[PDB]
């Protein structure tokens, strides 16, 4: 007796509801901005990755307008056939210059960039050392390779060295980590990891989705912040969808790497290139961060202020260091309930559970941005005070 | 003694050059249109997926402009956190209505839509029956599941029935096929596959990247063309990047499938939603095909005109039933030589040979579009005449 479509779907949704993991996302009814509309109310938004306030900045929109009008709505092909236009190259040139790498290649997302670059680089016999809290896109990248996969305890460089001591290969050794961990907000210890990689002849792969536009001067990233951006055995991959407020992912490094990716990255070979309006906006984003580098200063001013007041109220921010400021709730239902209560106070910050974070490590991610005002952050803090007291998790 | 980054890149590029697989994409210098510029020359373009001539259409661009101005450059989040806006819902409503399915969900790409839907649906114990010529994105979707994978010979429903007789499960049986196969331009025999699925209590999964906007009334797709659009045990996945001339993929079907994907599809959970200008253009595309359904008629008129003159000259178009028009050259060298010679005549089309198709089945892939004129197709045909005569494959 084989299952029909509705019966498999129904069983899975029922399983998710019993495990307390089932979700009902909200619809935003105004632009992506530090205050927006949810369910018909003005809310302070701490749920987005809009770090630099670019998502609705008029300068990105004007550059997007220009490219849209001139080139059109769609590329109409994959990059390697008839999908590469002058505007793709212009962006790869500007991005390489910004990153201070020899080359940059843009892929259709951060999610697919991880599949493309890890797929292109890795072969049977290779050994990968993954931080246990690596983003899900990296797990999927690695599962499509025939590399041996090992996991080191989160940011635990003593444990990484033990595995480097114990697991040799004539092939590639790849140490893979988020630059900034999506849901934890802490920074990979590259100052220790990169030297450790040179000691054991390993290459380091940094997924810098939450470091790009955040860490380093003018937000050039985690690798740049630790000063390794010219190291040939360091490979950077990052989304253009967070601080840079568009879509796409990039890979940065030697021109030889770019050429291997153009030839081997499956998402690059088999998926349409990005359209004019998206590339125009990203060109605008790189121009704007050059004109207004004070946006990164402002982001970090708001962060230290907001993170300090949350700690002061008695909340566990998991040793987050970046504008990502998590509040642990443990069980997913408490995370959802806290979120619902915050929304009652006009504060939008979304409870997160398994898949996206571990079982019993459910949390609300708060992401502070350059465009938040003190008034907005104080409204959010006041709501975290009231909701925290009502739930008995603080004073 | 392990390999450094430069050494692995160098070895892979060297391998690709020796095996004749190394590629150097061309850069297009004008918009995606039936005539464009490549390498400083005007060409009749038969290399794009721009089936309805939407990629640079002023109606899609004006709708994109309107959404960009109103909503901005970026969504700034994944759909399940703070990335769903009014405009995503507007598109999923109009798309479901257009397809005549209960539900429609947009994902980051056609490529990732296959990973999301196959991942959400499939579990250990399930049995998948794949057409052997299924697109690469389906392979990657299936490799991330624990389903038992079986391959039936291309379009061979006798062979499918043998495997259906031999392999039962208490779980899901999923028959997976392209709707239109990229390489020979043939249509999945759904009129035989779907009855065969009802006989063995299987669900059918159709990747309709090359059927969406092409087959069915107003290009509602292969499944609609065979009349199975309201069947809950038929699941559609398709790119919005080809006929619809933007980016993204959709999943269309049963109302509860959407909700399972929102909760479980990894590409949906872990990749940023698409921005205003992309969604605005796709809204425009669906409105435009409603106002000008004669564009689908024109697409098919141009196809029959192009195929008729090739048959008359003595070329073999491999039984293609779609605007995808392969011209057999046999040996890969002769297919690449013909392609280069067509470009010399100002005609841009894609040579394909071994690896990508079998030994002795090399061809030039042409895609005819609604926006090609008789003048453009006559230029292409005249070049096929000259090149064919010079190579001694025709009179
Ligand atoms: C957000 C994120 C991605 C995916 O970026 P998209 O462009 O949204 O696919 C990948 N890796 C990490 C660590 C991320 O945080
Ligand atoms: C084009 C295509 C895809 C991928 O669509 P993208 O949106 O370009 O990623 C997937 N499957 C098939 C069969 C295709 O033809
Ligand atoms: Na207070």
CSV table of N, CA, C and O in Angstrom, one decimal, chain A residues 2-6 8-9 12 22-23 27-28 30 32 47 49 55-56 61 68-69 71-76 82 84-86 108 112 115 121 123 126 136 140 143-144 171 173 201 232-233 235 241 245 247 256 259-260 263-264 266 272, chain B residues 2-5 8-9 12 22-23 25 28 30-32 49 55-56 61 68-69 72-76 81-82 84-86 102 108 112 115 121 123 126 136 140 143-144 169 171-173 201 232-233 241 245 247 256 259 263-264 266 270 272:
chain,number,residue,atom,x,y,z
A,2,UNK,N,1.0,1.9,-1.2
A,2,UNK,CA,1.9,3.0,-1.4
A,2,UNK,C,1.2,4.3,-1.0
A,2,UNK,O,0.0,4.3,-1.1
A,3,UNK,N,2.0,5.3,-0.6
A,3,UNK,CA,1.4,6.6,0.0
A,3,UNK,C,1.1,7.5,-1.2
A,3,UNK,O,1.9,7.6,-2.1
A,4,UNK,N,0.0,8.2,-1.2
A,4,UNK,CA,-0.4,9.3,-2.1
A,4,UNK,C,0.3,10.5,-1.6
A,4,UNK,O,0.8,10.5,-0.5
A,5,UNK,N,0.4,11.6,-2.5
A,5,UNK,CA,1.1,12.8,-2.2
A,5,UNK,C,0.5,13.5,-0.9
A,5,UNK,O,1.3,13.8,0.0
A,6,UNK,N,-0.8,13.7,-0.9
A,6,UNK,CA,-1.5,14.4,0.2
A,6,UNK,C,-1.2,13.6,1.6
A,6,UNK,O,-0.9,14.3,2.6
A,8,UNK,N,1.5,11.6,2.4
A,8,UNK,CA,2.9,11.8,2.9
A,8,UNK,C,3.0,13.3,3.4
A,8,UNK,O,3.5,13.4,4.5
A,9,UNK,N,2.5,14.3,2.7
A,9,UNK,CA,2.6,15.7,3.2
A,9,UNK,C,2.0,15.8,4.5
A,9,UNK,O,2.5,16.4,5.5
A,12,UNK,N,3.9,14.3,7.4
A,12,UNK,CA,5.1,15.1,7.8
A,12,UNK,C,4.7,16.3,8.5
A,12,UNK,O,5.3,16.7,9.5
A,22,UNK,N,6.7,23.1,13.8
A,22,UNK,CA,6.0,23.6,12.7
A,22,UNK,C,5.9,25.1,12.7
A,22,UNK,O,5.8,25.6,13.8
A,23,UNK,N,6.1,25.8,11.6
A,23,UNK,CA,6.2,27.3,11.6
A,23,UNK,C,5.2,27.9,10.6
A,23,UNK,O,4.7,27.2,9.8
A,27,UNK,N,4.2,37.9,6.9
A,27,UNK,CA,4.3,38.6,5.6
A,27,UNK,C,4.6,40.0,6.0
A,27,UNK,O,3.8,40.6,6.7
A,28,UNK,N,5.7,40.6,5.5
A,28,UNK,CA,6.0,42.0,5.7
A,28,UNK,C,5.2,42.8,4.7
A,28,UNK,O,5.2,42.4,3.6
A,30,UNK,N,5.5,46.4,4.4
A,30,UNK,CA,6.3,47.6,4.0
A,30,UNK,C,7.7,47.1,3.7
A,30,UNK,O,8.1,46.0,3.9
A,32,UNK,N,11.9,46.4,3.4
A,32,UNK,CA,12.9,45.9,4.4
A,32,UNK,C,13.6,47.0,5.0
A,32,UNK,O,14.5,47.6,4.3
A,47,UNK,N,14.7,41.3,12.8
A,47,UNK,CA,14.6,39.9,12.2
A,47,UNK,C,15.4,39.8,10.9
A,47,UNK,O,15.7,38.7,10.5
A,49,UNK,N,18.6,40.6,7.8
A,49,UNK,CA,20.1,40.6,7.6
A,49,UNK,C,20.4,42.0,6.9
A,49,UNK,O,21.5,42.1,6.4
A,55,UNK,N,18.9,47.7,1.7
A,55,UNK,CA,17.7,47.0,1.1
A,55,UNK,C,16.7,48.0,0.5
A,55,UNK,O,16.1,47.6,-0.5
A,56,UNK,N,16.5,49.1,1.1
A,56,UNK,CA,15.6,50.1,0.5
A,56,UNK,C,16.3,51.5,0.4
A,56,UNK,O,15.6,52.5,0.5
A,61,UNK,N,18.7,51.5,-5.6
A,61,UNK,CA,17.5,51.4,-6.4
A,61,UNK,C,17.7,52.2,-7.7
A,61,UNK,O,17.2,51.7,-8.8
A,68,UNK,N,18.4,47.8,-15.3
A,68,UNK,CA,17.1,47.2,-15.7
A,68,UNK,C,16.7,47.8,-17.1
A,68,UNK,O,16.4,47.1,-18.0
A,69,UNK,N,16.6,49.1,-17.1
A,69,UNK,CA,16.1,49.9,-18.3
A,69,UNK,C,17.0,49.6,-19.5
A,69,UNK,O,16.5,49.3,-20.6
A,71,UNK,N,19.4,46.9,-19.9
A,71,UNK,CA,19.7,45.5,-20.3
A,71,UNK,C,18.4,44.6,-20.3
A,71,UNK,O,18.5,43.5,-20.9
A,72,UNK,N,17.4,45.0,-19.5
A,72,UNK,CA,16.1,44.2,-19.4
A,72,UNK,C,15.9,43.5,-18.1
A,72,UNK,O,16.6,43.7,-17.1
A,73,UNK,N,14.9,42.5,-18.2
A,73,UNK,CA,14.4,41.8,-17.0
A,73,UNK,C,15.1,40.5,-16.8
A,73,UNK,O,15.1,40.0,-15.7
A,74,UNK,N,15.8,40.0,-17.8
A,74,UNK,CA,16.4,38.6,-17.6
A,74,UNK,C,17.6,38.4,-18.6
A,74,UNK,O,17.7,39.0,-19.7
A,75,UNK,N,18.6,37.6,-18.1
A,75,UNK,CA,19.8,37.2,-18.8
A,75,UNK,C,19.5,36.2,-19.9
A,75,UNK,O,20.1,36.1,-20.9
A,76,UNK,N,18.5,35.3,-19.6
A,76,UNK,CA,18.0,34.3,-20.5
A,76,UNK,C,19.0,33.1,-20.7
A,76,UNK,O,18.7,32.3,-21.7
A,82,UNK,N,25.1,31.5,-23.0
A,82,UNK,CA,24.8,32.9,-23.5
A,82,UNK,C,24.3,33.8,-22.4
A,82,UNK,O,23.6,34.7,-22.7
A,84,UNK,N,26.4,35.3,-19.8
A,84,UNK,CA,27.4,36.3,-19.3
A,84,UNK,C,27.3,37.5,-20.1
A,84,UNK,O,27.5,37.4,-21.4
A,85,UNK,N,27.0,38.6,-19.5
A,85,UNK,CA,26.9,40.0,-20.2
A,85,UNK,C,28.0,40.9,-19.6
A,85,UNK,O,28.6,40.5,-18.6
A,86,UNK,N,28.3,42.0,-20.3
A,86,UNK,CA,29.2,43.1,-19.8
A,86,UNK,C,29.0,43.3,-18.4
A,86,UNK,O,30.0,43.5,-17.6
A,108,UNK,N,24.6,32.2,-8.2
A,108,UNK,CA,23.2,32.6,-8.1
A,108,UNK,C,22.7,32.7,-6.7
A,108,UNK,O,21.8,33.5,-6.5
A,112,UNK,N,24.0,28.1,-3.1
A,112,UNK,CA,24.5,27.4,-4.3
A,112,UNK,C,26.0,27.6,-4.4
A,112,UNK,O,26.7,26.6,-4.8
A,115,UNK,N,27.7,25.0,-2.7
A,115,UNK,CA,27.7,23.7,-3.5
A,115,UNK,C,28.7,23.7,-4.6
A,115,UNK,O,29.5,22.7,-4.8
A,121,UNK,N,36.3,22.0,-5.8
A,121,UNK,CA,37.6,21.9,-5.1
A,121,UNK,C,37.8,20.5,-4.6
A,121,UNK,O,39.0,20.1,-4.6
A,123,UNK,N,37.6,16.2,-3.9
A,123,UNK,CA,37.6,14.9,-4.6
A,123,UNK,C,37.7,13.8,-3.5
A,123,UNK,O,38.0,14.0,-2.4
A,126,UNK,N,40.1,13.4,-0.2
A,126,UNK,CA,40.3,14.7,0.5
A,126,UNK,C,39.7,14.5,1.9
A,126,UNK,O,38.8,13.6,2.1
A,136,UNK,N,23.7,25.3,7.2
A,136,UNK,CA,23.2,24.1,6.5
A,136,UNK,C,23.6,24.0,5.0
A,136,UNK,O,23.8,22.9,4.6
A,140,UNK,N,25.2,20.7,2.8
A,140,UNK,CA,24.6,20.2,1.5
A,140,UNK,C,25.7,20.2,0.4
A,140,UNK,O,25.8,19.1,-0.3
A,143,UNK,N,27.9,17.1,1.3
A,143,UNK,CA,27.2,15.8,1.0
A,143,UNK,C,27.2,15.5,-0.4
A,143,UNK,O,27.1,14.3,-0.7
A,144,UNK,N,27.4,16.4,-1.4
A,144,UNK,CA,27.4,16.2,-2.8
A,144,UNK,C,28.9,15.9,-3.3
A,144,UNK,O,29.1,15.8,-4.5
A,171,UNK,N,45.9,14.0,-0.7
A,171,UNK,CA,44.9,14.9,-1.4
A,171,UNK,C,44.8,16.3,-0.7
A,171,UNK,O,45.8,16.7,-0.1
A,173,UNK,N,43.4,18.8,2.2
A,173,UNK,CA,42.8,19.0,3.6
A,173,UNK,C,42.1,20.4,3.6
A,173,UNK,O,42.8,21.4,3.4
A,201,UNK,N,49.6,22.0,6.4
A,201,UNK,CA,49.4,22.1,4.9
A,201,UNK,C,48.0,21.9,4.5
A,201,UNK,O,47.7,21.1,3.6
A,232,UNK,N,47.2,32.6,-0.3
A,232,UNK,CA,46.7,31.7,-1.4
A,232,UNK,C,45.9,30.5,-0.9
A,232,UNK,O,45.1,30.0,-1.7
A,233,UNK,N,46.2,30.0,0.3
A,233,UNK,CA,45.4,28.8,0.8
A,233,UNK,C,44.2,29.3,1.7
A,233,UNK,O,43.9,28.5,2.6
A,235,UNK,N,40.2,30.5,1.0
A,235,UNK,CA,39.1,30.7,0.0
A,235,UNK,C,37.9,31.3,0.7
A,235,UNK,O,37.5,30.7,1.8
A,241,UNK,N,23.4,38.8,-0.3
A,241,UNK,CA,21.9,38.9,0.0
A,241,UNK,C,21.7,39.5,1.4
A,241,UNK,O,20.5,39.8,1.7
A,245,UNK,N,22.4,43.4,0.4
A,245,UNK,CA,21.0,43.6,0.3
A,245,UNK,C,20.5,43.4,-1.2
A,245,UNK,O,19.7,44.2,-1.7
A,247,UNK,N,20.7,39.6,-4.0
A,247,UNK,CA,20.9,38.2,-4.0
A,247,UNK,C,22.2,37.8,-4.7
A,247,UNK,O,22.7,38.7,-5.4
A,256,UNK,N,43.0,31.6,-11.1
A,256,UNK,CA,43.0,30.2,-11.4
A,256,UNK,C,41.8,29.5,-10.7
A,256,UNK,O,41.2,28.6,-11.4
A,259,UNK,N,38.5,30.3,-12.7
A,259,UNK,CA,38.5,29.5,-14.0
A,259,UNK,C,38.1,28.1,-13.6
A,259,UNK,O,37.3,27.5,-14.4
A,260,UNK,N,38.6,27.5,-12.5
A,260,UNK,CA,38.1,26.2,-12.1
A,260,UNK,C,36.6,26.2,-11.8
A,260,UNK,O,35.9,25.2,-12.3
A,263,UNK,N,34.4,26.3,-14.8
A,263,UNK,CA,34.4,25.0,-15.5
A,263,UNK,C,33.7,23.9,-14.7
A,263,UNK,O,33.1,23.1,-15.4
A,264,UNK,N,33.7,23.9,-13.4
A,264,UNK,CA,33.3,22.7,-12.6
A,264,UNK,C,32.1,23.0,-11.7
A,264,UNK,O,31.5,22.0,-11.2
A,266,UNK,N,28.6,23.1,-10.4
A,266,UNK,CA,27.4,22.6,-11.0
A,266,UNK,C,26.3,23.6,-11.0
A,266,UNK,O,25.7,23.8,-12.0
A,272,UNK,N,20.5,29.7,-14.5
A,272,UNK,CA,20.6,31.0,-15.1
A,272,UNK,C,21.3,32.1,-14.3
A,272,UNK,O,21.2,32.1,-13.1
B,2,UNK,N,50.5,16.9,1.6
B,2,UNK,CA,49.2,17.3,1.0
B,2,UNK,C,49.4,18.4,0.0
B,2,UNK,O,50.4,19.1,0.0
B,3,UNK,N,48.4,18.5,-0.9
B,3,UNK,CA,48.2,19.5,-2.0
B,3,UNK,C,47.8,20.9,-1.4
B,3,UNK,O,47.0,20.9,-0.5
B,4,UNK,N,48.4,22.0,-1.9
B,4,UNK,CA,47.9,23.4,-1.6
B,4,UNK,C,46.9,23.7,-2.6
B,4,UNK,O,46.6,22.9,-3.5
B,5,UNK,N,46.2,24.9,-2.4
B,5,UNK,CA,45.1,25.4,-3.2
B,5,UNK,C,45.5,25.5,-4.7
B,5,UNK,O,44.8,24.9,-5.5
B,8,UNK,N,45.9,21.9,-6.4
B,8,UNK,CA,44.6,21.3,-6.7
B,8,UNK,C,44.0,22.0,-7.9
B,8,UNK,O,43.6,21.4,-8.9
B,9,UNK,N,43.9,23.3,-7.9
B,9,UNK,CA,43.3,24.1,-9.1
B,9,UNK,C,44.0,23.8,-10.4
B,9,UNK,O,43.3,23.4,-11.4
B,12,UNK,N,43.3,20.2,-11.7
B,12,UNK,CA,41.9,20.1,-12.3
B,12,UNK,C,41.9,20.8,-13.6
B,12,UNK,O,41.4,20.2,-14.5
B,22,UNK,N,37.6,21.7,-21.2
B,22,UNK,CA,37.8,23.1,-20.7
B,22,UNK,C,37.0,24.1,-21.6
B,22,UNK,O,37.0,23.9,-22.8
B,23,UNK,N,36.4,25.1,-21.0
B,23,UNK,CA,35.4,26.0,-21.8
B,23,UNK,C,35.9,27.4,-21.5
B,23,UNK,O,36.5,27.7,-20.4
B,25,UNK,N,33.6,30.8,-21.8
B,25,UNK,CA,32.3,31.4,-22.2
B,25,UNK,C,32.6,32.7,-23.0
B,25,UNK,O,33.5,33.4,-22.8
B,28,UNK,N,28.3,38.4,-23.9
B,28,UNK,CA,27.3,39.1,-24.8
B,28,UNK,C,27.4,40.6,-24.4
B,28,UNK,O,27.6,40.9,-23.3
B,30,UNK,N,25.1,43.1,-25.8
B,30,UNK,CA,23.8,43.7,-26.0
B,30,UNK,C,22.8,42.9,-25.2
B,30,UNK,O,23.1,41.8,-24.8
B,31,UNK,N,21.6,43.5,-25.0
B,31,UNK,CA,20.5,42.7,-24.2
B,31,UNK,C,20.2,41.3,-24.8
B,31,UNK,O,20.6,41.0,-25.9
B,32,UNK,N,19.6,40.5,-24.0
B,32,UNK,CA,19.1,39.1,-24.4
B,32,UNK,C,17.9,39.3,-25.4
B,32,UNK,O,16.8,39.6,-24.9
B,49,UNK,N,17.3,30.8,-23.8
B,49,UNK,CA,16.0,30.2,-23.4
B,49,UNK,C,14.9,31.2,-23.4
B,49,UNK,O,13.9,31.0,-22.9
B,55,UNK,N,12.7,38.6,-22.1
B,55,UNK,CA,13.9,39.0,-21.4
B,55,UNK,C,14.2,40.5,-21.5
B,55,UNK,O,14.8,41.1,-20.5
B,56,UNK,N,13.9,41.1,-22.6
B,56,UNK,CA,14.1,42.6,-22.7
B,56,UNK,C,12.8,43.3,-23.1
B,56,UNK,O,12.9,44.3,-23.7
B,61,UNK,N,9.8,45.1,-17.8
B,61,UNK,CA,10.8,46.1,-17.3
B,61,UNK,C,10.1,47.2,-16.5
B,61,UNK,O,10.6,47.6,-15.5
B,68,UNK,N,10.5,47.8,-7.9
B,68,UNK,CA,11.8,48.3,-7.4
B,68,UNK,C,11.6,49.6,-6.6
B,68,UNK,O,12.1,49.7,-5.5
B,69,UNK,N,11.0,50.6,-7.3
B,69,UNK,CA,10.7,51.9,-6.7
B,69,UNK,C,10.0,51.8,-5.4
B,69,UNK,O,10.3,52.5,-4.4
B,72,UNK,N,12.1,48.4,-3.1
B,72,UNK,CA,13.6,48.6,-2.9
B,72,UNK,C,14.3,47.5,-3.7
B,72,UNK,O,13.8,46.8,-4.5
B,73,UNK,N,15.6,47.3,-3.3
B,73,UNK,CA,16.6,46.5,-4.0
B,73,UNK,C,16.7,45.1,-3.4
B,73,UNK,O,17.3,44.2,-4.0
B,74,UNK,N,16.2,44.9,-2.1
B,74,UNK,CA,16.5,43.7,-1.4
B,74,UNK,C,15.4,43.3,-0.4
B,74,UNK,O,14.8,44.2,0.1
B,75,UNK,N,15.2,42.0,-0.3
B,75,UNK,CA,14.2,41.4,0.6
B,75,UNK,C,14.9,41.3,2.0
B,75,UNK,O,14.2,41.4,3.0
B,76,UNK,N,16.2,41.1,2.0
B,76,UNK,CA,17.0,41.1,3.2
B,76,UNK,C,16.8,39.9,4.2
B,76,UNK,O,17.2,40.0,5.3
B,81,UNK,N,11.7,33.7,7.7
B,81,UNK,CA,12.1,34.6,8.9
B,81,UNK,C,11.5,36.0,8.6
B,81,UNK,O,10.4,36.3,9.2
B,82,UNK,N,12.1,36.9,7.8
B,82,UNK,CA,11.6,38.2,7.5
B,82,UNK,C,11.7,38.5,6.0
B,82,UNK,O,11.7,39.8,5.7
B,84,UNK,N,9.5,37.2,3.4
B,84,UNK,CA,8.2,37.2,2.7
B,84,UNK,C,7.6,38.5,2.8
B,84,UNK,O,7.3,39.0,3.9
B,85,UNK,N,7.3,39.1,1.6
B,85,UNK,CA,6.6,40.4,1.5
B,85,UNK,C,5.3,40.2,0.7
B,85,UNK,O,5.2,39.1,0.1
B,86,UNK,N,4.5,41.2,0.7
B,86,UNK,CA,3.2,41.2,0.0
B,86,UNK,C,3.4,40.8,-1.5
B,86,UNK,O,2.6,40.0,-2.0
B,102,UNK,N,-3.7,24.0,-7.0
B,102,UNK,CA,-4.2,24.6,-5.7
B,102,UNK,C,-3.2,25.6,-5.2
B,102,UNK,O,-3.7,26.6,-4.7
B,108,UNK,N,14.6,29.8,-5.0
B,108,UNK,CA,15.8,30.6,-5.4
B,108,UNK,C,16.1,30.3,-6.9
B,108,UNK,O,16.5,31.2,-7.6
B,112,UNK,N,17.7,24.6,-7.5
B,112,UNK,CA,17.4,24.4,-6.1
B,112,UNK,C,16.0,23.9,-5.8
B,112,UNK,O,15.8,23.1,-4.9
B,115,UNK,N,16.0,20.4,-5.5
B,115,UNK,CA,16.6,19.9,-4.2
B,115,UNK,C,15.5,20.1,-3.1
B,115,UNK,O,15.4,19.1,-2.3
B,121,UNK,N,9.9,15.8,0.2
B,121,UNK,CA,9.0,14.6,-0.1
B,121,UNK,C,9.6,13.3,0.3
B,121,UNK,O,8.8,12.4,0.7
B,123,UNK,N,12.0,10.1,1.7
B,123,UNK,CA,12.5,9.5,3.0
B,123,UNK,C,13.1,8.1,2.7
B,123,UNK,O,12.8,7.6,1.6
B,126,UNK,N,11.5,5.0,0.5
B,126,UNK,CA,10.8,5.5,-0.7
B,126,UNK,C,11.5,4.9,-1.9
B,126,UNK,O,12.7,4.6,-1.8
B,136,UNK,N,20.6,17.4,-14.7
B,136,UNK,CA,21.6,17.3,-13.6
B,136,UNK,C,21.1,17.8,-12.2
B,136,UNK,O,21.4,17.2,-11.2
B,140,UNK,N,21.1,15.9,-8.3
B,140,UNK,CA,21.7,16.5,-7.1
B,140,UNK,C,20.6,16.5,-6.0
B,140,UNK,O,20.9,16.1,-4.8
B,143,UNK,N,20.4,12.8,-4.8
B,143,UNK,CA,21.6,12.4,-4.0
B,143,UNK,C,21.5,12.9,-2.6
B,143,UNK,O,22.2,12.3,-1.7
B,144,UNK,N,20.8,14.0,-2.3
B,144,UNK,CA,20.7,14.5,-0.9
B,144,UNK,C,19.5,13.8,-0.1
B,144,UNK,O,19.3,14.2,1.0
B,169,UNK,N,6.8,-0.5,-2.0
B,169,UNK,CA,7.1,0.2,-0.7
B,169,UNK,C,5.8,0.6,0.0
B,169,UNK,O,4.8,0.8,-0.7
B,171,UNK,N,6.1,3.3,1.6
B,171,UNK,CA,6.3,4.7,1.5
B,171,UNK,C,5.9,5.3,0.2
B,171,UNK,O,4.9,4.7,-0.3
B,172,UNK,N,6.6,6.3,-0.3
B,172,UNK,CA,6.3,7.0,-1.5
B,172,UNK,C,7.0,6.3,-2.7
B,172,UNK,O,8.1,6.0,-2.6
B,173,UNK,N,6.2,6.1,-3.8
B,173,UNK,CA,6.8,5.8,-5.1
B,173,UNK,C,6.8,7.0,-6.0
B,173,UNK,O,5.6,7.5,-6.2
B,201,UNK,N,-0.1,3.0,-8.0
B,201,UNK,CA,-0.2,3.9,-6.8
B,201,UNK,C,1.1,4.7,-6.6
B,201,UNK,O,1.6,4.8,-5.5
B,232,UNK,N,-3.7,15.7,-7.5
B,232,UNK,CA,-2.8,16.0,-6.4
B,232,UNK,C,-1.6,15.1,-6.3
B,232,UNK,O,-0.6,15.4,-5.7
B,233,UNK,N,-1.6,13.9,-7.1
B,233,UNK,CA,-0.5,13.0,-7.2
B,233,UNK,C,0.4,13.3,-8.4
B,233,UNK,O,1.2,12.4,-8.8
B,241,UNK,N,13.2,31.2,-15.2
B,241,UNK,CA,14.4,31.9,-15.8
B,241,UNK,C,14.4,31.7,-17.4
B,241,UNK,O,15.3,32.4,-18.0
B,245,UNK,N,11.6,34.4,-18.2
B,245,UNK,CA,12.7,35.4,-18.5
B,245,UNK,C,13.1,36.2,-17.3
B,245,UNK,O,13.4,37.4,-17.4
B,247,UNK,N,14.5,35.0,-13.0
B,247,UNK,CA,15.2,33.9,-12.2
B,247,UNK,C,14.2,33.3,-11.2
B,247,UNK,O,13.2,34.0,-10.9
B,256,UNK,N,-1.3,21.4,0.4
B,256,UNK,CA,-0.5,21.0,1.6
B,256,UNK,C,0.9,20.9,1.2
B,256,UNK,O,1.8,21.0,2.2
B,259,UNK,N,2.9,24.2,2.1
B,259,UNK,CA,3.1,24.2,3.5
B,259,UNK,C,4.2,23.3,3.9
B,259,UNK,O,5.0,23.7,4.8
B,263,UNK,N,8.1,24.6,5.4
B,263,UNK,CA,8.6,24.1,6.7
B,263,UNK,C,9.9,23.3,6.4
B,263,UNK,O,10.7,23.3,7.3
B,264,UNK,N,10.1,22.6,5.3
B,264,UNK,CA,11.1,21.6,5.2
B,264,UNK,C,12.1,21.8,4.0
B,264,UNK,O,13.2,21.1,4.1
B,266,UNK,N,15.1,22.8,2.1
B,266,UNK,CA,16.3,23.4,2.7
B,266,UNK,C,16.7,24.7,1.9
B,266,UNK,O,17.0,25.7,2.5
B,270,UNK,N,17.0,28.4,3.9
B,270,UNK,CA,18.4,28.7,4.0
B,270,UNK,C,18.9,29.6,2.9
B,270,UNK,O,20.1,29.6,2.6
B,272,UNK,N,18.1,33.4,0.6
B,272,UNK,CA,17.3,34.7,0.7
B,272,UNK,C,16.3,34.7,-0.4
B,272,UNK,O,16.6,34.2,-1.5
